[PDB]
Amino acid sequence: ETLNGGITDMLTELANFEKNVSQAIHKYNAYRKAASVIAKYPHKIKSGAEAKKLPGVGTKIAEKIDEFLATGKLRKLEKIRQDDTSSSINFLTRVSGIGPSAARKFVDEGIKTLEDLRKNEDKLNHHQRIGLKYFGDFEKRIPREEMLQMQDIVLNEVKKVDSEYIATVCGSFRRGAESSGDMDVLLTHPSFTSESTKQPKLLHQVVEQLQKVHFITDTLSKGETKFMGVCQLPSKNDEKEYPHRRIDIRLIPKDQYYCGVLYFTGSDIFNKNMRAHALEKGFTINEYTIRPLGVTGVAGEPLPVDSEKDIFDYIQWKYREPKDRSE
DNA sequence: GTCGG
DNA sequence: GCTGATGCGA
DNA sequence: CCGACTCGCATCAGC
Ligand SMILES: Nc1ncnc2c1ncn2[C@H]1C[C@H](O)[C@@H](COP(=O)(O)CP(=O)(O)OP(=O)(O)O)O1
Ligand SMILES: [Mg+2]
Ligand SMILES: [Mg+2]
Ligand SMILES: [Mn+2]
Ligand SMILES: [Mn+2]
Ligand SMILES: [Mn+2]
Ligand code: NA
Ligand code: NA
Numbered sequence A: 001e002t003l004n005g006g007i008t009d010m011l012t013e014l015a016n017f018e019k020n021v022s023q024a025i026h027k028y029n030a031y032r033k034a035a036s037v038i039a040k041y042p043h044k045i046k047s048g049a050e051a052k053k054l055p056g057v058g059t060k061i062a063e064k065i066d067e068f069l070a071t072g073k074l075r076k077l078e079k080i081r082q083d084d085t086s087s088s089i090n091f092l093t094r095v096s097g098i099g100p101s102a103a104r105k106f107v108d109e110g111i112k113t114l115e116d117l118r119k120n121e122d123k124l125n126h127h128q129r130i131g132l133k134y135f136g137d138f139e140k141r142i143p144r145e146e147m148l149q150m151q152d153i154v155l156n157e158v159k160k161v162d163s164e165y166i167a168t169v170c171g172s173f174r175r176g177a178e179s180s181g182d183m184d185v186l187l188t189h190p191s192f193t194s195e196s197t198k199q200p201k202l203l204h205q206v207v208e209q210l211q212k213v214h215f216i217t218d219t220l221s222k223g224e225t226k227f228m229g230v231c232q233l234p235s236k237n238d239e240k241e242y243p244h245r246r247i248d249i250r251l252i253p254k255d256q257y258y259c260g261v262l263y264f265t266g267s268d269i270f271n272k273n274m275r276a277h278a279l280e281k282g283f284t285i286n287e288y289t290i291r292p293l294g295v296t297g298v299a300g301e302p303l304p305v306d307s308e309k310d311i312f313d314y315i316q317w318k319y320r321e322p323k324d325r326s327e
Numbered sequence B: 001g002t003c004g005g
Numbered sequence C: 001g002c003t004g005a006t007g008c009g010a
Numbered sequence D: 001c002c003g004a005c006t007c008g009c010a011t012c013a014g015c
């Protein structure tokens, strides 16, 4: 549906193969960087040489593009799709909690299908049992309309705990996406700063409240600053119950909000791009701060930030609306 | 797999 | 039973 | 040529 969708689809499938089967994370990132830069290219690619002009597209990817443009397919991908071990590992990783290591371990023991997981559920940990339970739901997209209803529940229940919590839905939702893969929530409270003593139960109070009104249905991981779990909109009068959804909550110091919003909003590739430019400009950006870089390349103190645009200003970038960060 | 060095 | 090692999602 | 490309949380192997 995009200018170079056939090429970027091929590159994404090759990326997932290198992550799930080969366990070569830098190849996975290399394919993703190539797909992202091609996705931003304003012309329809006619040759591998044309794509090779783009940063991140090298000899082999340009060669794969020429084959795909000539034959409409890739022999390398067709061999992968046919390899029983490769496609089995590739499938098992679609279960949340089953990564490349567990997928390879299961497949070696003849555990390679969904029904194999159900039959061998005793060998799954709690996370994997949940990922298997909601396997279909977790692959459904969340229409933005439903994200607004979820945002209403989250922000309202959070206010019910304490008036001074601030909850901001980030991720693809804040980037204006018509559909989202999950709900990502950033949480702050005046009592938690970078200079304050650990106030526990700050995130626990919010998670407990969302559980009490039956919004959060299951927990995958839960600590003092990060919650990973499952949520579900309420359904009306025995009508079609909603699909269960993944939700992430991150509690960050209030004085590092805007660096947190910038990171949590994404995209992941955009963050990689922005942080790469920051180093070319004498700064280093992470999830919490932007710091200067000295003559020796050492990181200074966190710089003052009171807006997302403040971070763009430091590295001398034109401000990008969250809508234009989906890279 | 790519690119800078 | 505890500690270090490792996998997981992001 | 070749080396570069973060963390909180859950679990469990190895004592
Ligand atoms: N591999 C990674 N490691 C660390 N941080 C990462 C990350 N990938 C993404 N992020 C950051 C930026 C995302 O906006 C934000 C959410 O990451 P995410 O997994 O929720 C993907 P998102 O951009 O929200 O779209 P969608 O598929 O859910 O509709 O977290
Ligand atoms: Mg042009
Ligand atoms: Mg249910
Ligand atoms: Mn079977
Ligand atoms: Mn998300
Ligand atoms: Mn998320
Ligand atoms: Na690699
Ligand atoms: Na190139």
Ligand code: NA
Pocket (backbone or CB within 6 Å): A092, A093, A094, A095, A096, A097, A098, A099
């Ligand atoms: Na998985």
